[PDB]
Structure 1
Amino acid sequence: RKQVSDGVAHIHASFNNTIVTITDRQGNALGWATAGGSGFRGSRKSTPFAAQVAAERCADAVKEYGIKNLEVMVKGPGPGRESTIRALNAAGFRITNITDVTPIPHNGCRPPKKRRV
């Protein structure tokens, strides 16, 4: 397979789970990991440690492509916003940019009703 030194890390942090997808600048994915497949289900899925483990696993998976420079694009709220980026830096990818791509509607579709727990 081909090798690339510049890539993007799309992080999708939800209130329940966290997704990490490493891709090329053209959005062509190379590898992904999730806190739900990293061994944490239910109450441990929505934790920053599981997010960092998922980031480590995604790095190990995409290791084949030999990536050095990496720009992170984080979306959605949740614990997996900073711990995963820290785990990436630990794995040793040269962070370049840290962007927020959280979809903020301008008073568009109305959200669902409130939970009366």
Structure 2
Amino acid sequence: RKQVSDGVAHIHASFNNTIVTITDRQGNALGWATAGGSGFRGSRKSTPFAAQVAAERCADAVKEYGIKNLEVMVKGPGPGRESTIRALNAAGFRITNITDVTPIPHXGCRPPKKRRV
């Protein structure tokens, strides 16, 4: 119920889903939406469109906070890397900064075995 105006949007863009979480500048979450909970399952959930719908719903969940400015942190290789950012600017927020925070091990742990499909 306290105003913030300066938040941070975190985009978790995996191959199967997109999670959008808006926090303040200290990491405290204010609201979230996901492509899977916006009415899409299966092959529809892992699309750029479903990611866009999630970005809108997240913008609505935090409209009480009076957020005006956003930094954007994108994480992952999924199809919702760009449509979520496009929708966050179309939602009225002023996109101040865009950053990739995808984790990269500097070697790290052995990955799972290759799939034989």
TM over 0.5: yes
TM-score, normalised relative to structure 1: 0.99
Q: CA deviation at 1:63?
A: 0.4
How far, CA to CA, are the matches of 1:12 and 1:30 in structure 2? 16
The answer for unaligned runs of 5 or more in structure 1 is none
Please state whether the residue corresponding to 1:105 is helix, strand or coil.
coil
Q: CA deviation at 1:10?
A: 0.4
How far, CA to CA, are the matches of 2:44 and 2:62 in structure 1? 24
Please state whether the residue corresponding to 1:86 is helix, strand or coil.
helix
Q: CA deviation at 1:35?
A: 0.6
TM-score, normalised relative to structure 2: 0.99
Runs of 4+ in 1 over 6 A off after TM superposition: none
Q: CA deviation at 1:9?
A: 0.2
How far, CA to CA, are the matches of 1:58 and 1:30 in structure 2? 9
Please state whether the residue corresponding to 1:10 is helix, strand or coil.
strand
Deviations for 1:64-116, whole angstroms, at most 9, x for unmatched residues? Answer: 00100000000001111000000000001000000000000011001000000
Cα RMSD, aligned residues only? 0.4
How far, CA to CA, are the matches of 1:107 and 1:43 in structure 2? 33
Q: CA deviation at 1:4?
A: 0.7
Q: CA deviation at 1:2?
A: 0.2
Give 1:37-76 correspondences, 5 Å limit: 37-76=37-76
Deviations for 1:10-60, whole angstroms, at most 9, x for unmatched residues? Answer: 000000000000000000000000011000001001000000100000001
Match of 2:101 in 1: 101
**When the two structures are aligned, how many residues end up with a matched partner?**
117
Please state whether the residue corresponding to 1:81 is helix, strand or coil.
coil
